[PDB]
Amino acid sequence: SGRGKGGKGLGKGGAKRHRKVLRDNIQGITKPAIRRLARRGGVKRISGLIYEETRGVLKVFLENVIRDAVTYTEHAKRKTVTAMDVVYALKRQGRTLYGFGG
Amino acid sequence: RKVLRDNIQGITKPAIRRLARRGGVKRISGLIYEETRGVLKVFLENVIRDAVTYTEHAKRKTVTAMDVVYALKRQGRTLYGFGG
Amino acid sequence: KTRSSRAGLQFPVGRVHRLLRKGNYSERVGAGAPVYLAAVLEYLTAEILELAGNAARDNKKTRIIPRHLQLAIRNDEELNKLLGRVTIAQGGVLPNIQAVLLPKK
Amino acid sequence: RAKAKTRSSRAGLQFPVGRVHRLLRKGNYSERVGAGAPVYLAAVLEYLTAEILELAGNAARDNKKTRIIPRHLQLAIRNDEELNKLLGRVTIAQGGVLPNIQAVLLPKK
Amino acid sequence: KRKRSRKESYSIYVYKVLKQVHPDTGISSKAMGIMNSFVNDIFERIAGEASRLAHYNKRSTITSREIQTAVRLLLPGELAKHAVSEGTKAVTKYTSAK
Amino acid sequence: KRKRSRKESYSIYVYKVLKQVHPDTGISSKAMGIMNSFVNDIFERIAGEASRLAHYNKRSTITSREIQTAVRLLLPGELAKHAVSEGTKAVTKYTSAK
Amino acid sequence: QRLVREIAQDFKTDLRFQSSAVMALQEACEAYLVGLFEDTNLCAIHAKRVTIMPKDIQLARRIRGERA
Amino acid sequence: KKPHRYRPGTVALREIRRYQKSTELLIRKLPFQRLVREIAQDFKTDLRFQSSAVMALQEACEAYLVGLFEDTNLCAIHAKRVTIMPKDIQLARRIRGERA
Ligand SMILES: [Ca+2]
Ligand SMILES: [Ca+2]
Ligand SMILES: [Ca+2]
Ligand SMILES: [Ca+2]
Ligand SMILES: [Ca+2]
Ligand SMILES: [Cl-]
Ligand SMILES: [Cl-]
Ligand SMILES: [Cl-]
Ligand SMILES: [Cl-]
Ligand SMILES: [K+]
User: Fold this and answer.
1) Chain D residue closest in CA terms to F17
2) For residues D72, D75, D80 and D82, what is the CA-based torsion angle, rounded to 10 degrees?
3) At which residues is N6,N6-dimethyllysine found (chain B)?
4) Buried b (16+ CB within 10 A) or exposed e, H64-85
5) Pair H21, D99: CB distance under 8 Å
6) Is the Cβ pair A102, F40 closer than 8 Å?
7) Chain E hits for B81, Cβ within 8 Å
C-alpha cells in the first residue's frame, strides 16, 4: 500500500548505481570544532550541553538553506546543486554571501 | 516652553507604562522612560526620513499614508491597513 | 464565460494577469501563471477569513474587525510565520504573561 | 562616421556606462531607461568600489601585503561605521571577524 | 467633482470569498484594509520570487511553474502543500474549460 | 575543443579603480570575487529601489532622479553625499560632452 | 502628532501630513515598542530579574541588529 | 617546581586571539561534506554538488555559528555568567526571530 500512488518524480528506491546512500555524520561536527567556532565568537567558557544544542541548530540552518538550494536545482531541471543555488538560497534566508557568484 | 520644543516629553511615563504592560512587562526601572524616548525617536527619525524622501521625490508638500507604508516596508516593518 | 469562472475562482484572473505584465517582473507572462497566482491568493484569503470569522462568532460579533484577523493569524503557527514581519493595524497582541511574573499557587 | 568614444569616457568614468545601461534594460526594473540613469549608477558603483579599495589597501599595507585578500575587505568594512551598516547583513567569504574580547572575560591584572 | 481617482482594491473578491466560507458574517473597513494589504503583500512576494526564478534561469516568461516554485519557497510546509494543490487544480480546470 | 562560454565580471573596472587609489596594490582572485558580489549587490539594491520609486509615482522611466533618490534611501549619511556628488558630476560632464 | 511634525521639520520645512499618515506612524511605533518590551522582558527574566532596565533594551536591540 | 600548568581561562583567551586572527574554516571539510549530502537526501535522492556549492554552504554555516556565538556570549554576560549555556543560544535565537 505505502501511502502515495505517484512517486516517479521523487526517484526514491535508489541503490547500487555505485556505492552511495550516506550514514550519520552530525557527530563529525566534533566538540573541538564547536569550541573553535565559539572561540572565533569570543566565547571563553562553554557548558557541556552546548555541543549537542549547536548540532541541533547547525542541522536546522542546513535543512533550511539546502531545501531552498535544491528547490532552485529542481526548478532548473538539474541533478547537480551549483554554488549559485546556495547563494540564491542564502539571499532568500536574509544571509547574503559574497565571493561565490552573483 | 521646553516640552513644546522637546515634544518627546509628551510621550508620558503613563503612556510608556501602558505600552510595556501590553508587552507583558510587570515591573519597570525609573531609567526606562528616558531610554524608551531615545529609542522611539530613532525609530521615527528613520521612518520619517524615508517617508519624507518619498514626499520630496513625488514633488509634494504633504506626507501621505503611502509615503509611510513604503518607508515602513523599506525598514522591514511592513504595515497592513493603511493602503498596502 | 469569464477567465475566473473557467478556473473556478472568485479572484480576478484578468486583473492579476495585467498586474504581472505591467508590474516589471518579466518580458512575457504565460496563461497559467495568473490562474495559479489568483487561486493561491484566493486559498490564503479563504484560510484567514474562515479563521477570522470563527474568532468573530466566538465574540458574538457578525463583523470581522482587525483583532479577529490578528487572533486568527497569531494562533496559527504557519500563518504567524508567513506574517512574522507584518504589523496588523488595530490588531493588538495575544494574551500572554511569563510564568515567573504570576503569583505562587 | 565613427571616431567613437565610450559613454564611460564622456562621463569621466572607469565603470562601464554602456554595460550598466544594458543591465538596467534586461534586468526587468522599468519599461524605459533615461540616458542619465546608467551614468549616475555607474558613477555610484565606482565611488563605492573606490571607497572599499582605499580602506582594504590600507589594511593590506598594514599587514605588509601587496595584494588585498578577503580579510583586508572584512577589516576595512567592519571597522568603518557606514560600510558596516551598508553590508550589515552580508557574509564575506574567508573574511573572519574583528579581534574583539568582552572586557569581563579578561583576567584581573 | 467625480474625482476620488478610481483606486482599485481586492475588496469585492474578499467579500465574495467571505460569503463562501461564512455567508452571515461581514467585515469592518479597517479589517478589509488589512485583507487588501495582505493580498498585495503576498502577490508582490510570489511575483518577485517568480521574477528572480525566470531571471536566474535566463527565461523571458513567468509561467505557472515559476509561480509554483515561488509558492514552495515562500509558504511554510502545510500552507505550501494546499496552495500548490489549489493552483494546480485551478490551472487544470481552466485548460479543460478551453 | 570549445572556448569556454563568456562570463562577464566587473574585475577590469575594479583593477582600474584600484590603480587610481593604490597604484602599488594588487588583489587576490577571491578578493575580486567579493568585489564582484558587492557591485552586483548594490546594483540590485539601487535599481530595485528605483524600480519602486518610478512604480509608486506611475512613471514608466527610471531617470537619474530615481537613481539619486534610491541612493539617498540606501546609502548611509557621508557615503550618500559623496555618491550623489559623483553621480551629479558624471551626468553633468556626460550631458555637456553630449 | 506634535512629535512627528517636530521630527519631520529637521528633514523638510512647512510639511503637511494626511491624518492617516500620522495614524500609520503611531500604529507602527506602538507595535515596534510593544514588541521591543516583549524582548526586553525576556532579557530581564534571563538575568533572574522581574524589572526591565535600560541594558535589557540595549541587549534586545543589539541581538535584533538595530544597534552595533 | 612542578610541570607547567596554565590556569583555567588562559588557554581559552589564547585560542580566542588565535581564531579571531585567522579566516580558515574550523569544521573539518569531509565530515561537513558528508553531513551536507546526508541532509540533501531528505529533499532529493542522487544529488550531485559542485565543490564550490559545498564550500559556499560551509562559509555560510561557520559565519552563522560564529555570529550566534557572539550573541549567545552577550546573553551569558547579561546574566552575569562567563559560561554560555543552551538558554543563552535559545534567548539569542528567540530575540533574533529565528524561533517562536
Ligand atoms: Ca473550491
Ligand atoms: Ca475553505
Ligand atoms: Ca492553516
Ligand atoms: Ca510548519
Ligand atoms: Ca591614493
Ligand atoms: Cl535620465
Ligand atoms: Cl503558464
Ligand atoms: Cl540599565
Ligand atoms: Cl541551559
Ligand atoms: K522587478
Assistant:
1) D50
2) 80
3) 2
4) bbbbbbbbbbbbbbbbeeeebb
5) yes
6) yes
7) 30, 33-34, 37
List D32's β-bridge partners, or say none: F61
Please answer yes or no on whether C44 and E62 come within 8 Å at the CB atom.
Answer: no
Fold annotation for C1-102: Histone, subunit A (1.10.20)
Superfamily name and number for G1-67: Histone, subunit A (1.10.20.10)
Cα B2 from chain centre:
20
Domains in chain E, ordered, with CATH? 4-97 (1.10.20.10)
Region A19-102: CATH code: 1.10.20.10
What's the C50 CA to ligand 2 centre distance in angstroms?
7
For E51, the 3-state DSSP assignment is: helix
Query: In this structure, what is the dihedral angle of CA atoms F40, F45, F48, F50, given to the nearest 10 degrees?
Result: -110
Per 3-state DSSP, what percentage of chain E is helix, strand, and coil (rounded to 5)? 70, 5, 25
- Main-chain phi, psi angles of B3, to 5 degrees: -70, -35
Interface of G with C in 28-67 (CB under 8 A): 28, 31-32, 34, 38, 41-42, 45, 50
Residues of F in contact with B70 (CB under 8 A): 52, 56
Query: What is the phi-psi region of residue E79: left when phi exceeds 0, alpha when psi lies from -120 to 50, beta otherwise?
Result: alpha
Class of domain B1-84: mainly alpha
Query: In CATH, what is the architecture of D1-106?
Result: Orthogonal Bundle (1.10)
Query: Among residues 34-93 of chain E, which lie with CB inside 8 Å of chain D?
Result: 51, 55
Q: Is the dihedral of CA E36, E42, E44, E47 positive or negative?
A: negative
> For residues F70 and F50, is the Cβ–Cβ distance under 8 A?
yes
Chain D contact for H11, CB < 8 A?
no
Chain A residues close to E72, C-beta within 8 Å: 71
Size of chain A in residues = 102
DSSP of A30-79: -HHHHHHHHHHTT--EE-TTHHHHHHHHHHHHHHHHHHHHHHHHHHTT-S
Instruction: Give the technique used to solve this structure.
Output: X-ray
H16-99 CATH: 1.10.20.10
Extract the C-alpha cell encoding D96.
573572519
In the reported structure, the alpha carbon of residue E96 is separated from the centroid of ligand 1 by a whole-number distance in angstroms of 16
- Kindly give, in sequence order, each residue whose CB lies less than 8 Å from that of residue D26, ignoring residues fewer than 6 positions away: none
- Going from the Cα of A50 to the center of ligand 9, the distance in angstroms, rounded, reads 9
Question: CA C68, C74, C76 angle in degrees (round to 5)?
Answer: 100
Cα separation of D24 and A56, whole Å? 43
DSSP letter, residue F57: T
